A paper describes a structure:
SNARE (soluble N-ethylmaleimide-sensitive factor (NSF) attachment protein receptor) proteins drive membrane fusion at different cell compartments as their core domains zipper into a parallel four-helix bundle. After fusion, these bundles are disassembled by the AAA+ (ATPase associated with diverse cellular activities) protein Sec18/NSF and its adaptor Sec17/α-SNAP to make them available for subsequent rounds of membrane fusion. The side-loading and side-release mechanism explains how Sec18/NSF can disassemble SNAREs with constrained topologies.
Informed by a fluorescent protein disassembly assay, we initiated the disassembly reaction and waited 7 s before sample vitrification. The D1 ring is also flat in all these substrate-free classes, with all D1 protomers bound to ADP. In the D2 ring, all protomers are still ATP bound, consistent with their role in oligomerization. Class 4 consists of a configuration where both D1 and D2 rings are heptameric and class 3 is similar to this heptameric class, except that the seventh protomer is only partially occupied. We observed heptameric states of Sec18 and NSF, split-open hexameric states of Sec18 and NSF and a transition between split hexamer and heptamer of Sec18. Hydrolysis likely accelerates the transition from hexameric to heptameric state through the split-open state for two related reasons.
Numbering used by the authors:
A (entry chain A): 239 to 357, 368 to 479, 488 to 758
B (entry chain G): 424 to 477, 498 to 758
């Protein structure tokens, strides 16, 4: 027909919203029922809500749907806003008096409905009057579309007003496979596509794509092939797109609800060496937790707190575990992203991020510098109370409909939090200690290729009686290692710096 | 930039209106962070020289009239922040060599793209002068300093926006260096309350840990005199190393400074040291106090008897 994917969410719509219009009026009057006059659809944007309405309109041979934009109506002047509403139904009013019950169906679409409630009342009253009051008109069907259903007032959901409500979800593997066929039918049917392009393999690569992104991918793949000949030149007889074109195209479209790999890779991780058994144990436990998440139904929410001395290396283990997981959705809420925003802006941003996190089979959230987000200072102490309750509630809430996410946050003020009485939110705690032995320093120096063994042993010999009880984290040690490499006397500088740091 | 020069000067070349002694290759290297409009302005100014006269020197003189963005704030750094430099002790040389090593490390490493150092000590030691002197010898294209003088008479909201905009501009050149002066005064600290602004502190705390994008790098220097206050607000985990600047406590350094400042003949320079030997052998004063007391003594009728009195008072 023209729509792929959604199969079970279309039969139900056709059963209720349109099944009655087919039958002759005689039997309908015999039954003693009335036609439904409202319908609501909600879901994430760019998923194909208008397409199904347009395509189901053609089967009934109805008039071409009109369209209205909520923000457009609200933005115009008040008088024109009041006047234009009566204009939409003019044709339905005329044809009704013209013919009577034997008239044809007219369908109207309304977009961004929730904008009217987000603050307007005149348009809502006029809409309800035409479909419920003594001015009832028996030839129209109104469809409303919104991205946030909880904001629509409950008064509109009672019988006689928007009786039927439906939800649209992101496509499954089968949905992506079917939409690809729907898009490439024309190329396939006229022999302009190579024989090496395999769609079953393409379906898996695009993970959290929506339909629009798949269409854009096809467009870019066609553009790749087209550009290869220009610079217009008559050679167009053997033009055939190939797999390599689509593989190159994949690196061109970055989707929403996708992996923010750049932040994970660049800023956070720039070196990783296993100098002790505890690091291996921590990584093994992290991998075990990941596999627990992947193959269990009883655990859908896990939150962890990694704590240790300042500069221990907390942020590196989290990102290292996250990257190897291979999840489709990964994101971080950090002071960098929240910098420069107002308090209410921060509340809205956190709420929106959490709402977005509830729209993927698997997710990861990294909250950076938990104590800094609340803007705590020990002098007062001072803090913003409103943000604290939001964060406290959000850390326990579960995602809906068999979805799962993992939240991880880092802090160095364990005493402040335990005093604040929010330690009941975190399911488990992990402690990452600092180095306390010289044999660990030997491995650290070895794996970074600081210099030859002859000078390597001398540093240990000197530190053996310089200061045997040093206590320094990985960051400072690795910074001193590099800052001693650009000097005339590496040994003395390294020894002095490491002793001073301790 | 060479191709931009070629495009701009093609019209001049094509009509034999350009001298043969001008080489575009050297100009492509002298202009380090210029843009197309900057090159257009430079060419226009150079041609103005030739027009007014009725060459290479024309462009060299035009280079002195156009100042680009992302350039060097030469006047602010050179004049106010540096008014003398003398090696009175070994510690100064050690600090300078460490600073040079760090500057070279930042330029010749991939792992280190963000280095922060903290310079603290008793008031009047000379921290700010060292901070600017280290940056001046680096030669990086981009240099800026944030001091209270810029933010005087501003509101808090404008202050945050200004600092954030400066840090945003910092991420658009291959190399950058930033200087922060008198951290405690920027935050409006008074101990009775204590009173201060928390939003600016949090913004600075977040900024100091961020890393630049796309294999870019920058260096940060900060000067302070309230180490204990910074300890109270637990922001000591941001800086990866510290340097201490003590005051003077020996008469040999005083003699060296006196010799360097051209006080007077050795006869009186010996007498001053002999008097201070048993006047107060345990004095402790900074460089700023001494370099002003020496200035004061010179214009007096009895410099020897006045400098000793000033040293006694300061101690
Ligand atoms: N095994 C390791 N574990 C942790 N950090 C490591 C390791 N190997 C190398 N590093 C280096 O340690 C440096 C310190 O990491 P990072 O800055 O994330 O630590 P931190 O203690 O969370 O810091 P912050 O003081 O900002 O809270 C990183 O640049 C990383 O390059
Ligand atoms: N080796 C030196 N190091 C520092 N300053 C020196 C040195 N030799 C001479 N001076 C002079 O010391 C004077 C005082 O230094 P400077 O102006 O940097 O003060 P400061 O430490 O920034 O002051 P304040 O603590 O009041 O902010 C400078 O004018 C400089 O001319
Ligand atoms: N299942 C699907 N099959 C083919 N195309 C789809 C599908 N879902 C969405 N699209 C594409 O989405 C576009 C229209 O989506 P849109 O009108 O923006 O819906 P909504 O506004 O409800 O997100 C069309 O160009 C269509 O090709
Ligand atoms: Mg971190
Ligand atoms: Mg100062």
């Amino acid at each position: 027909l023209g729509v792929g994917g959604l199969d079970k969410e279309f039969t139900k719509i056709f059963r209720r919203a349109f099944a009655s219009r087919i039958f002759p009026p005689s039997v309908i009057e015999k039954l003693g029922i009335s036609h439904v006059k409202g319908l609501l659809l909600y879901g994430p944007p760019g998923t194909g809500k208008t397409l199904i309405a347009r395509k189901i309109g053609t089967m009934l041979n109805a008039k071409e749907p009109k369209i209205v934009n909520g923000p457009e109506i609200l933005s115009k002047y008040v008088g024109s806003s009041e006047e234009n509403i009566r204009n939409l139904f003019k044709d339905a009013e005329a044809e009704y008096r013209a013919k009577g019950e034997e008239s044809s169906l007219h369908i109207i679409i309304f977009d961004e409905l929730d904008s009217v409630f987000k603050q307007g009342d005149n348009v809502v009253n006029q809409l309800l009057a035409k479909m419920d009051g003594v001015d009832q008109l028996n030839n129209i069907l109104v469809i409303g579309m919104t991205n946030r259903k909880d904001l629509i007032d409950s008064a509109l959901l009672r019988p006689g007003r928007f009786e039927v409500q439906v939800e649209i979800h992101l496509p499954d593997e089968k949905g992506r496979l079917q939409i690809f066929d729907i898009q490439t039918k024309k190329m396939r049917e006229n022999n302009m596509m190579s024989d090496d392009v395999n769609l079953a393999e393409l379906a898996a690569l695009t993970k959290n794509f929506s339909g629009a992104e798949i269409e854009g991918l096809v467009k870019s793949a066609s553009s790749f092939a087209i550009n290869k000949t220009v610079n217009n030149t008559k050679d167009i007889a053997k033009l055939k797109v190939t797999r390599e074109d689509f593989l190159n195209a994949l690196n061109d479209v970055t989707p929403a609800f996708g992996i923010s790999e750049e932040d994970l890779k660049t800023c956070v991780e720039g070196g990783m060496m296993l100098y002790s058994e505890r690091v291996n144990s921590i990584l093994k436990n992290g991998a075990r937790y990941v596999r627990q998440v992947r193959e269990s139904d009883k655990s859908r929410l896990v939150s962890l707190l990694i704590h240790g001395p300042a500069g221990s290396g907390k942020t590196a283990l989290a990102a290292e575990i996250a990257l190897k997981s291979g999840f489709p959705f990964i994101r971080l809420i950090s002071p960098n992203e929240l910098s420069g925003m107002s308090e209410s802006a921060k509340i809205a941003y956190i709420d929106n991020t959490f709402r977005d996190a509830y729209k993927s089979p698997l997710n990861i959230l990294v909250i950076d510098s938990l104590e800094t987000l609340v803007d705590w200072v020990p002098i007062g102490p001072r803090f913003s109370n409103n943000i604290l309750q939001m964060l406290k509630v959000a850390l326990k809430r579960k995602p809906p409909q068999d979805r799962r996410l993992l939240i991880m946050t880092t802090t160095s003020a364990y005493s402040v939090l335990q005093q604040m009485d929010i330690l009941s939110c975190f399911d488990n705690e992990i402690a990452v200690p600092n180095m306390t032995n010289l044999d660990e320093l030997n491995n650290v120096m070895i794996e970074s290729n600081f210099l030859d063994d002859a000078g390597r042993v001398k540093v240990i010999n000197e530190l053996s009686r310089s200061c045997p009880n040093f206590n320094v984290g990985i960051k400072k040690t690795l910074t001193n290692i590099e800052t001693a490499r650009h000097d005339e006397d590496p040994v003395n500088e390294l020894v002095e710096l490491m002793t001073q740091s301790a």
